[PDB]
């Protein structure tokens, strides 16, 4: 869907 | 007595006035009459002043029955006019010529020496309302047809209207103008360089040349419309950009003519088409236009930035390849970068043929040998922009603005300056430079390509006059004229790049859109509109086709050979076939309407069901009829075209859309009956047909009359190897049935065809240097030896592929004994075993060199094998390997290309080049290892050797080249220049504006400079860098990977040469190298504005006098080395967990390698010293890699002082973690402004991206640290930086709900309309998370976008 909280290497769209 | 005389020919009688050079009427043999000037008009215009002549001002002399001479006394004391004009009127067939044979100025002695100002110069001349030919409203079918310039596919350049009593025109100017009425038709031709009314032109390159002036007058009851010439220029006074005035003589003396026509095309009517047929006898014809129909294969062979991507003898092999595939069809090769260092280098030094490409010697060999295959050559020249390095560069040549400053051009390799167009012409500087080129090429070169002429870079003028003078200089040297823009040079150009390459510019900037101009000149120019449906109008399947240009030799990265050839057959064979015939009739044009001023346009419902049709004919009376399927654009049939040759169908169907949108169904069997030289008809055994079927399949055709009685034909499939797969096809009732593969060329002969013989690599000292000779080049020319395999692999640009243990050798020919040579070869080695190039004289090794696995990808856009060419596995590591030798006295010299390994991996070799080279800067040890390498860049065969261009720009026309000396212009202090281009000698290695890239610019490679495992080397070079720490020295092993390199920032050395020196220890894998890295540090532009920022040199780096020297290292014992292994081990063995899998594997690799040296049986102190120096280097590397690991933790944790000391001790400010996050990313993300600002002041990349594409700003904005966001924006962060997902810092600010962060982001240049890869804007992301407050602010901001 739309990530809980983003950071280094954590894409905004992961599910 | 009688005030008129009669001139007579067998075709007509013309009555002329004795009191003025005026025609009363033309009477044809059949009785039909055309009028002239029936009124007493005796006006002469000189310098804008009209003077009416009396009976005493004109004297007449009937010379012959076909000539009369007049002497006109043109005087006006008040306006400073006193002249004697000699006008001659001559008749020949149905033509009447009126020429001004002499101009005598009584108020002047002439043009003073050096083209000084002539006081009272006769600048312009015309005969207002001369009415040389006229039509009346009272005559049957009285009409006018005119043409003006249009480069817009939606706007026709034509006019067709009936002459009625209501008609009222006064000096309506047109390029062409035709009048018809009472059974006759005529068109006026003048050489006037007058510029006027046009329909659409994006430039001024003689695009606006209007030479006919239509004016009406009352002749009793009727309105008469009469044609006259537009004004002529005689001694024109011009001003240069520095205000200096010149008087420049005529390009030619005033000339004009009319050709009276009846029903020339024998249809029902007498219209402009009859007048246009007769106009061809009087019209000017572009120089060498009679060869245009033969030029089937146009292309560009490019060279750029010292790289010699396409040497002249390579271009000859590609001419031989295309000739094979097209069966000898004519070619036209534009050499883009034939001079100096390449393309946009050394302008305007036209006589400077590129020394690195083989100089004037190889250029003439290419041209002389290429003519044998029907290839024509031409060079790209520039008369508008100049570079300081060009020997023609002067303060007089420099274009200056109204403020007295330089008129700067484009800066890429060096900064371009505008040339003073008027000075360059009036001083006779340009003629002198063309002459220099003429002295080099003689009568071998075919054309000149003039770039940018018309875009107002040299003057604000660049009018028809200036263009005519320019075209004359070029034609005078025996060269055909070609230019850039589509509308440019109506008069003399035979090709426009922006008309022939349909890709460029868009629908408003194409070729000449006129039924009149194309009807007249289709067979003389490639200056039209071809098929490119997305432009509509003239670009939607024109019946006459249109040149569609593709390239395969580096131009704009273009290198698809198969696409090049497929395109020639798809659009250019048919276009050229049609250019072998001249238009005679052209009816039912769908583009001409009453609303676009073409009410009287030619409409025949009894021709092609009322749809478009063109009838073309040749001197031998052969008829080609090209007919359109339907005139309705919404019909499938609008794109259907049938072509008949002497009544027989030769082509049929829809072509593949020229924009490559949709393939068609067109199939043809075109009779090619001309040679590729003079275009003369060939004999029966030499007669052929070209077959093509877009969709593939079986089609039945009627053979031409000449072939009707044959019982069989011979069909060949055309490939890069010529005529293949010969088939014997039967003929039944003059008809053949051909089975064709889709989009595959076949050639049909009456009998057995002899194969075009090609001797690959002529003058190249080897046979088949480019491996273009098929699988049998390895049998016939090269001799393969070994257990392994040698294959000619590559479906585009063929290569030599070696697998396992194999040697590919060939004897070297025509070398000058005792002379120094350089042999280089392109090599891409994917094996771990050495790939070698060796030169031998009877078993003895003269010279040898080798590469292990290739470590540097190829980034040269204009090179055949760059990393976008997929040599193997989506990359290309092609780089040239050199051997320097002296040709043996005995003559016996041999080249071998070897692979030693039994390894299944491939090695790629291409383009063996043996060239004379005086380089002698490599000294070897007793063992074949490097002792010393020095280079001042004074004898570089090609490129920036021993360096290779890295990927700071990716696959590009790289801003790195060998810079040339031209003092004072290339030295510091000239104008705004602060850096010297050259440090020592005539050449250096220049880097232009490659700042803040955060990556490698250029590096040495082991096949160039090999650093022995464990050996110490002292590297030194002279340099100049525009700012402190913008460029740095990089030292690394194997392929470049960020952080694996040892960076040393280089201090500013601007105007005064600096000296850099360092030590290097060869890595255990022998893959060690050094280079120049572009840091993340911003340059100090020192207050400079605009172009001065680029010209000043604040962002440049020049390198010279390189010296690599192997040095002695303090001698160690087995014990000293064994003791260092313990030191290193009990320091870093304790970090197995803390290190990556790869980081620990390389630490083990090095340790094992060092331990082999120590414990080897029979090791000596050299081995123990090497083992110790490897370990010392390993320690220094491990230590700095742990300082980077600890800095990434202190930026995340928050320790201010710790980050400072780690940084002070040399920890990399741009170190990356497992996710590619820098310390600046981790400080902005966890919110520490203190760390962020000190990191910025140090040289951290504010626009560095992690794996996912997050800049620190993205992480700051998503988290809500607004003070960090403000600092980032001020220190240079991109506010519109995009994620891999298209997410910008605004989206993350909006979704996570940070109102203040959102407002500061859009306070700076943040786009509110910006969408991610799923079409979501920051607003849509706010209305998904519930931030209606953020959504309202964002909505309001987007609203203002009005
Ligand atoms: Mn006619
Ligand atoms: Mn090749
Ligand atoms: Mn030098
Ligand atoms: Mn240069």
Residue numbers in the entry:
A (entry chain D): 1 to 15
B (entry chain B): 339 to 1684
Paper text:
Here, we show how peptide and protein targets can be reproducibly crystallised as “guests” in a host crystal under predefined conditions, and we explain the advantages and current limitations of the host lattice-display method. In order to apply this approach to biological macromolecules, we engineered a host lattice comprising auxiliary- and target-binding domains; Fig. 1B outlines the design strategy. The auxiliary domain defines the robust host lattice by providing the majority of crystal contacts, and thus also the crystallisation conditions. It serves as a scaffold for rigidly positioning the target-binding domain to immobilise guest molecules at well-defined positions.
Using these mutations, DARPins B6 and G10 were fused to EngBF using the L1 construct. These DARPins bind a cyclic peptide of 15 amino acids cyclised by a D-Pro-L-Pro unit (c-pep1). The EngBF-L1-DARPin_B6 difference map was sufficiently clear to build residues 6 to 14 from peptide c-pep1 independently of prior structural knowledge, and the structure turned out to be virtually identical to the previously determined structure of DARPin_B6:c-pep1. After refinement, the c-pep1 main chain and most side chains were defined in the final ED map.
